[PDB]
Amino acid sequence: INLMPDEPTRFTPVFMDRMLEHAESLNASDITIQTGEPIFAEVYGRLLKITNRRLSNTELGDLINSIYGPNATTQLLSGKDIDTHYEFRPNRGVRYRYRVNATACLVEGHDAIQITLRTIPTTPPKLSTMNLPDNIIEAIAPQEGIVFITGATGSGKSTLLASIIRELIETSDSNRKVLTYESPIEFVYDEIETISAVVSQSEIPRHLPNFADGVRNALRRKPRLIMVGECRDAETISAALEAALTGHPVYTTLHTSGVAETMRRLVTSFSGEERLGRTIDILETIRLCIWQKLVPTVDERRVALREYLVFDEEVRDILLEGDPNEVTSATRKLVRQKGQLMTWDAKMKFEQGIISERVYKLIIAGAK
Amino acid sequence: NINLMPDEPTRFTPVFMDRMLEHAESLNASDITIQTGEPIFAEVYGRLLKITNRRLSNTELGDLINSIYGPNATTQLLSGKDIDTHYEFRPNRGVRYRYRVNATACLVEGHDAIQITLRTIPTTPPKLSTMNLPDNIIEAIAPQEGIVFITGATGSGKSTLLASIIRELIETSDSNRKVLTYESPIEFVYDEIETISAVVSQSEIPRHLPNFADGVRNALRRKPRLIMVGECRDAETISAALEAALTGHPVYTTLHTSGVAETMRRLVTSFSGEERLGRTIDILETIRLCIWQKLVPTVDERRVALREYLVFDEEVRDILLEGDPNEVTSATRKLVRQKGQLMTWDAKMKFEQGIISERVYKLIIAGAK
Amino acid sequence: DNINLMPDEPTRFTPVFMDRMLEHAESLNASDITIQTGEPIFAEVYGRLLKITNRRLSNTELGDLINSIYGPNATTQLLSGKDIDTHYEFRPNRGVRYRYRVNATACLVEGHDAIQITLRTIPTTPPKLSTMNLPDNIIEAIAPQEGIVFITGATGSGKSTLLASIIRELIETSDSNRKVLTYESPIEFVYDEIETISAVVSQSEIPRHLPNFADGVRNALRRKPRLIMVGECRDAETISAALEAALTGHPVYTTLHTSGVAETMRRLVTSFSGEERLGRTIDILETIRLCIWQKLVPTVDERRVALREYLVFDEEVRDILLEGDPNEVTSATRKLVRQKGQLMTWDAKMKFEQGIISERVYKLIIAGAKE
Numbered sequence A: 001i002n003l004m005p006d007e008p009t010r011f012t013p014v015f016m017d018r019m020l021e022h023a024e025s026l027n028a029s030d031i032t033i034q035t036g037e038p039i040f041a042e043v044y045g046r047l048l049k050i051t052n053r054r055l056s057n058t059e060l061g062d063l064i065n066s067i068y069g070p071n072a073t074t075q076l077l078s079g080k081d082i083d084t085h086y087e088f089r090p091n092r093g094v095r096y097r098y099r100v101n102a103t104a105c106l107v108e109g110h111d112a113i114q115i116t117l118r119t120i121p122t123t124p125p126k127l128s129t130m131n132l133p134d135n136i137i138e139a140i141a142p143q144e145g146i147v148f149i150t151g152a153t154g155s156g157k158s159t160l161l162a163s164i165i166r167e168l169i170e171t172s173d174s175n176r177k178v179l180t181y182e183s184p185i186e187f188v189y190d191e192i193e194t195i196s197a198v199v200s201q202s203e204i205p206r207h208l209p210n211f212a213d214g215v216r217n218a219l220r221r222k223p224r225l226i227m228v229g230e231c232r233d234a235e236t237i238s239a240a241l242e243a244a245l246t247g248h249p250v251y252t253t254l255h256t257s258g259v260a261e262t263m264r265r266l267v268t269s270f271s272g273e274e275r276l277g278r279t280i281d282i283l284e285t286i287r288l289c290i291w292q293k294l295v296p297t298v299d300e301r302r303v304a305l306r307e308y309l310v311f312d313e314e315v316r317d318i319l320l321e322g323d324p325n326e327v328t329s330a331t332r333k334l335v336r337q338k339g340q341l342m343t344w345d346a347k348m349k350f351e352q353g354i355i356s357e358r359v360y361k362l363i364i365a366g367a368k
Numbered sequence B: 001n002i003n004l005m006p007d008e009p010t011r012f013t014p015v016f017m018d019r020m021l022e023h024a025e026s027l028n029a030s031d032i033t034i035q036t037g038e039p040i041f042a043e044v045y046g047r048l049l050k051i052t053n054r055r056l057s058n059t060e061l062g063d064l065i066n067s068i069y070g071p072n073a074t075t076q077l078l079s080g081k082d083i084d085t086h087y088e089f090r091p092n093r094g095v096r097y098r099y100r101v102n103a104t105a106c107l108v109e110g111h112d113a114i115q116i117t118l119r120t121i122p123t124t125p126p127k128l129s130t131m132n133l134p135d136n137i138i139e140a141i142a143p144q145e146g147i148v149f150i151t152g153a154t155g156s157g158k159s160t161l162l163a164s165i166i167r168e169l170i171e172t173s174d175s176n177r178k179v180l181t182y183e184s185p186i187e188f189v190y191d192e193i194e195t196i197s198a199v200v201s202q203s204e205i206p207r208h209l210p211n212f213a214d215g216v217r218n219a220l221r222r223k224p225r226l227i228m229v230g231e232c233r234d235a236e237t238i239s240a241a242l243e244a245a246l247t248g249h250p251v252y253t254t255l256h257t258s259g260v261a262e263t264m265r266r267l268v269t270s271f272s273g274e275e276r277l278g279r280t281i282d283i284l285e286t287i288r289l290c291i292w293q294k295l296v297p298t299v300d301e302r303r304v305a306l307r308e309y310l311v312f313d314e315e316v317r318d319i320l321l322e323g324d325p326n327e328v329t330s331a332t333r334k335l336v337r338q339k340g341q342l343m344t345w346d347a348k349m350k351f352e353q354g355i356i357s358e359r360v361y362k363l364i365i366a367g368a369k
Numbered sequence C: 001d002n003i004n005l006m007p008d009e010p011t012r013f014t015p016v017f018m019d020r021m022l023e024h025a026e027s028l029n030a031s032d033i034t035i036q037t038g039e040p041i042f043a044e045v046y047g048r049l050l051k052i053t054n055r056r057l058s059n060t061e062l063g064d065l066i067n068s069i070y071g072p073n074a075t076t077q078l079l080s081g082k083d084i085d086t087h088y089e090f091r092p093n094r095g096v097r098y099r100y101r102v103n104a105t106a107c108l109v110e111g112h113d114a115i116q117i118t119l120r121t122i123p124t125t126p127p128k129l130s131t132m133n134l135p136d137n138i139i140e141a142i143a144p145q146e147g148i149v150f151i152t153g154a155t156g157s158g159k160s161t162l163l164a165s166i167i168r169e170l171i172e173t174s175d176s177n178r179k180v181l182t183y184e185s186p187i188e189f190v191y192d193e194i195e196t197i198s199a200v201v202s203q204s205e206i207p208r209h210l211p212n213f214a215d216g217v218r219n220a221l222r223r224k225p226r227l228i229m230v231g232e233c234r235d236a237e238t239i240s241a242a243l244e245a246a247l248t249g250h251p252v253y254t255t256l257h258t259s260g261v262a263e264t265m266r267r268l269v270t271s272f273s274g275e276e277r278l279g280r281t282i283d284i285l286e287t288i289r290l291c292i293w294q295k296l297v298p299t300v301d302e303r304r305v306a307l308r309e310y311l312v313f314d315e316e317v318r319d320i321l322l323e324g325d326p327n328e329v330t331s332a333t334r335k336l337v338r339q340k341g342q343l344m345t346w347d348a349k350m351k352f353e354q355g356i357i358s359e360r361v362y363k364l365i366i367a368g369a370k371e
Helices: A013-025 A057-068 A072-078 A134-139 A157-170 A211-219 A234-246 A259-268 A272-285 A313-321 A324-338 A342-352 A357-367 B014-026 B058-068 B073-079 B135-140 B158-171 B212-222 B235-247 B260-269 B273-286 B314-322 B325-339 B343-352 B358-368 C015-027 C059-070 C074-079 C136-141 C159-172 C213-221 C236-248 C261-270 C274-287 C315-323 C326-340 C344-354 C359-370
Strands: A030-034 A040-043 A046-049 A082-088 A096-107 A110-119 A145-150 A176-182 A197-203 A225-228 A249-254 A286-296 A302-310 B029-035 B041-044 B047-050 B082-089 B097-108 B111-120 B146-151 B177-183 B198-204 B226-229 B250-255 B287-297 B303-311 C032-036 C042-045 C048-051 C084-090 C098-109 C112-121 C147-152 C178-183 C199-204 C227-230 C251-256 C288-298 C304-312
Touching (some): A030 A057, A030 A096, A057 A072, A057 A082, A072 A110, A134 A302, A145 A157, A145 A234, A145 A259, A157 A225, A197 B029, A225 A234, A234 A249, A234 A272, A259 A302, A259 A324, A272 A286, A272 B260, A313 A324, B014 B029, B014 B097, B029 B058, B029 B097, B058 B073, B058 B097, B135 B303, B198 B212, B212 B226, B212 C112, B226 B235, B235 B273, B260 B303, B260 B325, B273 B287, B273 B314, B273 B325, B273 C261, B287 B343, B287 B358, C015 C059, C015 C098, C032 C059, C032 C098, C059 C098, C074 C112, C147 C159, C147 C236, C147 C261, C159 C178, C159 C199, C159 C288, C227 C236, C261 C274, C261 C326, C288 C344
Parallel strands (some): A145 A286, A176 A197, B146 B250, B226 B250, C147 C288, C178 C199, C178 C227, C227 C251
Antiparallel strands (some): A040 A046, A286 A302, B029 B111, B041 B047, B082 B097, B287 B303, C042 C048, C288 C304
């Protein structure tokens, strides 16, 4: 609990950096700025006011425009949302990073803006911390094809991918041009400074219209690794399929829960006439699928369960030579024989005592 | 790990970029990547090497791109747009260097920034003798009719290969060949080759004719002796080319499938059940030759071409036509084993000859199974 | 020396000198003449390709030629990324007349956009029907009072020709009071030479004269034809237009890219969305009169021969098809080809015993169709 050392009479972007310094000195996870209200910081679950002035819609608009460009205000007034990234160096020391989100709300009967900065770590966690089977590590760096991390949002998939990239990039003799396309650019790799790799990070609302546009653009840049934050629609899926067929590792995430179910989503994304071709493409290209789920622990902290299949040459052949109409079933069997089920990982964790009995039984019930 | 340019400026200016480029070519770079907050990189033989020790500034890069494209280029990047263009320049020698350039906006250290990428554009088809090709391929490379597939990953030099084939069929006297090629982006041209009795028409598919398939269908209207289709991805183009071959025209195409048997599987599966059997017979009858090509590092730190090929003799084709169509893939495997040449076999031969590294050999063996 | 130079080669090539050069090429018995930017004019005589000029033509010359053949805006059309197909006739000093299919396509020469034109010689007159070697069934079925006749098959199966022959038969005979309207896109066959009494033939080219094949048919409905020729019916639009024309009571003749009578049926029925498609299907069944799928297969003589699988849609066939379940029309049709029609395989067999096709080829046909 503190107050800002030198609050300005009016808040200008220059002062926002100082305010952020103050918040970090307090160890704030999050900083919330709203028009009708003082600046708030959340330290350790408690919300504290870090300024004794209520800001103004003009001030907030200025802040957001500085952070995300001249048209940010107009974008908010159009009825859109802003997600971006903000970073600063206080004085040639360490650097401060943030995921920033501006949204329109209604304050005192008038349109206004609310901007939220969430502290994001500087470097992706190492892969060893992720606690991954050896199978996955062997499957994690294919020459070509698609790697999918699936699960409901807040499963920490972005973190995982970020980590893989770090691993793939940091090592010597990894001559990899990496191109990522991210809605919000969660992670940066400037600190890692690998010997023979480059990472170019393009933010989708700011730098390039679309995720699909992004990938198709990557095809023109001769990357060795392509990161697409999400592939929700069939355009992005098709772009990524071309990139993979072209011969480039593609890494993406999906909202689907379950490797077989994931397959079903991929195949159905396309109309009937396209769907057979599209399916052959997908089966050919896929290399690895992981569905991650964050579940509460006995310690009241979160743990990652994971159901994965590695799509070996053998698996891929099985799927391609078989009747396509039932890929979904086939994959379901294959995860059982060559992969790892969500229920199985849940049981392992339960025997380890990491998860509660009730949670385990829940997972078993859902998987049924 | 890092081969530096000779005369590195304090701040990088378009004049120097030209100098920087010649150097990269001297190193035999395919691609040059310039990014803010990073040194200039060149890809030589799949390895990335830094061409300078100095990290370029955003302003420098903006200047470069403005020079290559236009004054408004930086703004356009600020727009949230992508730049694709080309850059040519005339060295000391005068014979020009040219590149496909692409500038895209990214975020570097919290600030908007630019990345430019320059990709070398080959011009002149190799000679076929330089390709190092078995004789049984050379005998089979000029069928009267049917389809010749060069398959492999992008950047395996299949474009170069078929360019070389075309050169060979064009430059020989008494080769009365009207050649029509349809390619995504035209890379190889045949104006420099002198011909006595051949014509080559090159149509670019985004610019000149909407589809590859359209392109082929157009070729039929042009009545040439040889048809080149850059890629044959979907069942449309495959069907077009099947009609072209059934009519009586050599068709040459590429696929991204890895393996003769696998390529077969892709071709056959392209088609739904009711069309599927007919289409399959068509394919089997029309096929004349399949080469899957793979570029693999050598002892002297360069690259070499391994090839797994089958020549589809009349006998082979009969074998395939007699059999169960669902067993077409397997039968094809057997046929590459008996009458063709496997990727693994080529890898072994190269290893015994000392061209490929032991490690590399092992790696190759791993993949095929 | 594989060069046969043009008698009076101009300093720059202009359309008239194109006519003269064409004369020269005919004198050499050239099948095809290809003109390209940055290249001399070539003519193909039999196997051989021979340059007819020492000068390589400039892009502007070519553009002028094509504009002369196909309208001021031909160049711009090429630059759009489109492809030009048309037809070019010219009359020597002789009363005789020269006809070609012309095709112009855009290509890249020396790094610049350029043009390639190709003229392929066309005969003056459709073959006779008797030359076509058609069963008597088909000849009886070839001139219905109303309904649709489909000639289907892959490109290069000579369906266009066969159509031209039918039309020639129907216009040549006396007391055949037929106004014939064709919508051919590239017009390949002309009927000027036949010039018979009691028939008129109006041939409209689809790129040049009328936007679309469907537009073309709908236009024919306004002209009181007795016979309508549509080059192709890919669209549901064109199919619907032709269905209206047939329902009104006009013979319609078209081609399809599909292989097999049953398959052709499948395509026709599937063209239409679900709410429309049952009605659509009744219409189709009622209207159809004849389906011929044609395939050109090599002969022992190293020429080609035409195999045909046809069904004639008699009143009774049509009844069978209408009375049964709409959704399985394709299968019922499949059986009806077997029972009342003629299969590709059977024709292949008859040809083989006759010794027209080789064992291998016939063997192949059995393999594909049998499926």
